[PDB]
């Protein structure tokens, strides 16, 4: 019977699962009732993967699909250029899920043919169209692509969504995929006893409302999602008990639930304090299995 | 004493330890018996990153810095901002290694501070020209950058390289830095080292597939970084294994300087021909003088 572990290293070093950039920080939601449908980012603690998320980093928020050389529509694939089917997903594994926003697109045509020239094409998509339709291979691009083939990419920048009424970057909310999407990852939400979801958080290049960092929050660091795809560990309780350790001094700063859906949440010590105020170098260690029943020390 | 394990997925899943772009092949080196030096994916299979070696695909392939305005030096710090101590490193973790081309990047300032237009600046570095001295923790970018600050990027593509006679590009090649892990030899018994090939964007004089090689997966060091597995042998016999039927398709030797290798069935045969939706599976811990069962079509 297979011990649950998670990953002997520090947080600092590990990537955000909806964008593949570094973990600057923890978050609460700046509404702590608030609930997240995310589909990169989700795996249950037994190793089963949900929604769109990918096994590597190398995967996550990327897209690929032919297009016809003067036009707009990318006609969508898997990453390794297989047919997707939406049975069992909402899109492609990979698939960004930044909702509430524009992507600007870079992208290029595989493989390469080329003996010159800049293969690079970037373009912008409005996820919020109505031909936003993922869950049926496909989405349209706002400029049209001179050179036709085979495109893998990723986006680039984001910025406030068009159509919106001027609504700010809102990296809380999924996209629309459907157009009806049936096979989403189910949404989270805090599950009582004073608990509150830590959310991950790092930066994406592009401009909103405020003026301020661009920060995309997920559920779990990359890298954990991956040891629980290898691992498979049975659960063995209604929550896993962890702790935030300082791993040259040993001492425990935070304790925290990670829930069998894949989702972590603990205790703040008050609304000014919170896992916002702990440093990035601690390293989370697997205690032992409690009921949900079970109260956590107040963190900070 | 944890047993030591690779991780138990497919290697189609898994990512290249120079760029952060999936695993597409095993390939060997054009002669195949070449030592590389590649900075990033070295990493002991006790867990000892080499070289920039980062533990994160997000860390991999990629650099930060401050450039004045109206100035071309881009200034390097580690990827979280924090100085870069020249001295225990060749670059900051996770600087890219590919040699024997340009550059063609894309980066923006962090954090951003902006309510309109596109953040995004690109620009070029010859990393055989002068100037490019990471050691020295500053790298010159071919034009002037408009808007100082602090930048962090990648590579968003490659060509060959300029000022160079007009040699392609070579990515069995690392760039002068200006600590370095070691090279790696194959070590004998008709063994070669084996490489595990991703794509990067970039034109090259063939007009063919744009491959970086790597000595590992990077997915298998983060689980050596976590894991820290005592070595009890010179080479850790591994089978690549067809999770369907449990069927081995072939032997390999995991060297603890963190280099894979087989015995190629014959000139032209060998992993290159396997399929990349096996698993490397642990078998046991070997002396360096064992033989391996031959892979790849029989001549």
Known sequence: TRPFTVPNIPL?????????????????????????????????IDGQPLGTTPVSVSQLCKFRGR?????????????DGSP??????????????????????????????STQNNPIVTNSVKPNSQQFVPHLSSITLDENVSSGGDYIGTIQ???????????????WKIPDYGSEASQL????????????????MASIPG???????????????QEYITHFISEQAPIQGEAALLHYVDPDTNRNLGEFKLYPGGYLTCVPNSSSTGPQQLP?????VFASWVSRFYQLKPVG
Not at 102 to 113: A, F, G, L, R, V
């Open 157 to 171: 920048w984001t910025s406030p969504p068009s159509d919106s009424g001027g609504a700010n970057t809102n990296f």
């Open 185 to 200: 990852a189910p949404a989270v939400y805090p599950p009582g006893f004073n608990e509150v979801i830590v959310y991950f």
């Open 12 to 44: 600092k070093y590990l990537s955000n699962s909806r964008i593949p950039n570094p973990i600057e920080g923890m978050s609460l939601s700046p509404d702590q009732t608030q609930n997240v449908q995310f589909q990169n980012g989700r795996c249950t």
């Open 280 to 284: 990035l170098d601690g390293v989370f």
């Open 67 to 79: 297009i016809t050389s003067g036009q707009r529509v990318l006609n969508l694939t898997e990453l």
């Open 84 to 113: 997707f089917m939406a049975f069992a997903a909402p899109a492609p594994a990979g698939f960004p899920d930044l909702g509430s926003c524009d992507w600007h697109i870079e992208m290029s045509k595989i493989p390469n043919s």
């Open 207 to 221: 401009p909103n409302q405020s003026g301020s960092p661009n920060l995309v929050p997920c559920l779990l660091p």
